[PDB]
Symmetry: C2
Subunit: 290 residues, 2 copies
Amino acid sequence: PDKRSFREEHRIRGYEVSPDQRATIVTVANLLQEVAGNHAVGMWGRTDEGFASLPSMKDLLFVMTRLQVRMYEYPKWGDVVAVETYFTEEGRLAFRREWKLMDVATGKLLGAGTSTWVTINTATRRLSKLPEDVRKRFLRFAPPSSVHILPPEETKKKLQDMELPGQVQSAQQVARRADMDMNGHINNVTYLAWTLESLPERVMSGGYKMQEIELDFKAECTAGNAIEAHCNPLDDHSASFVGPAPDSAPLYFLSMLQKCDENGCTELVRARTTWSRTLEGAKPAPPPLS
Amino acid sequence: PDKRSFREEHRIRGYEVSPDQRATIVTVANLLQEVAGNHAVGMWGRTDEGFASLPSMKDLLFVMTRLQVRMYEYPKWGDVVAVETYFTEEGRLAFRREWKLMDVATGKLLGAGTSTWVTINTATRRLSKLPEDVRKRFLRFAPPSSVHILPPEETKKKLQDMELPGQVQSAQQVARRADMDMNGHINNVTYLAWTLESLPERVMSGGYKMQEIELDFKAECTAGNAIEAHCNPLDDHSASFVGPAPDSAPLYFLSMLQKCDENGCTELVRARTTWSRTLEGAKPAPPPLS
């Protein structure tokens, strides 16, 4: 009744921060994926491949289709932060995993994440309903579906359509054999990292910090595919930051990652990012109310 | 007399390992640089820039010109490892920082590192002797120069000359604004990561693990420079692994990283790597003999 969530502590490292010594969103996402994977290790153990364990999932795979992270205050280099994660039922096909990024010293809430996970068949990449025998077992580790770290009305919003070519275009990135996790799949955080290279350079230079990100994970690349990143503004004030210029408002951008060959392009990830110059660190409430 | 070394514990994360679930040499090097930087924080504090603190070094910079890492057994995903670091006097211009990579569970020694650090003038990139007033203060935190984690006769060996173009050539990598540490300089581990993309794909595929690496750090890139990686075999048995094929011996390769423009190329890093299919984890001895 209190082991329905999983908590880990990490110290923000020197190579994990931007010049303002604040952890990058890549570093935050890395911590979210590490604690989530360690939650699975605590539940089903450390198997011969790493992913959950394939117990009654021998040909099934958990795939995150939506990730939403809202940041209230970025931790700094040297800070000991705590990442608390849990998952709940989401309909009859999906699961909702959420994260609490917390400062250990003050106990305050630095950021919140929520996500949508489905089960696809490994040998068909097609959706597959977990057997009700199996789903009842996962939910033994789940808190009630009434638990929300972010307002549900502010989650699961459809992303705008991507106008192509993007106004900003990061150079052809090349997939490497290093950018592969232990399962052979490319890392989710790697898609996030490539996606944010398409952003205008004047956004980070202007002192804007990423306040919220909404990612749709649509397709997967492998090996050494060519990868292109496009970015579009979403309102006029954000369009001001594209290229050089001739109580501040927030910026909105829509970025997209795709793999390209001599046949056609295939969209990998789409992301809507919210940018602001100021935020505010908040205060939590414990999940043992269960 | 026991605070002359600095020890930190870390858990190898899921995204830090190769498909065989062993930590990559990039992950090891990342841990070496994090503990070394935290040693400086423990000595001179966390300053407004991060690098040491510029106390009587207001226009001075510590630059590592040689890094040598020997691996006895790579830790695996989930392992809690300990990194112990210290530095000693190295002549009258350089300092020798060394690392002990240890498994916390067994106490055994997983790997050893040693390095050479000089002081260059920030505003001239030219070498500059630290004042003897200042050097005497650093060495208060140093063990005697007789301390060696690796045999001195096996360190500080001149690397072979690089025949160009290399037999293997990784694609033009592009420097990004993300690949910059908090000081604006590109990260040492980033040079290491780029350098190992030039390796033949059949080396990692053949089950070979990096046994030792010797890096010379020669120049620095910035911003969005074009970066090229070349690799050459050093003996005939290693030359067998270049491209496809028509109690095992170790492989030897010489890799080089350079930045290129429309004027000329400038060498950044040169690395000699030793590759073997088997290693052996060893046993340490404490530094408090001081």
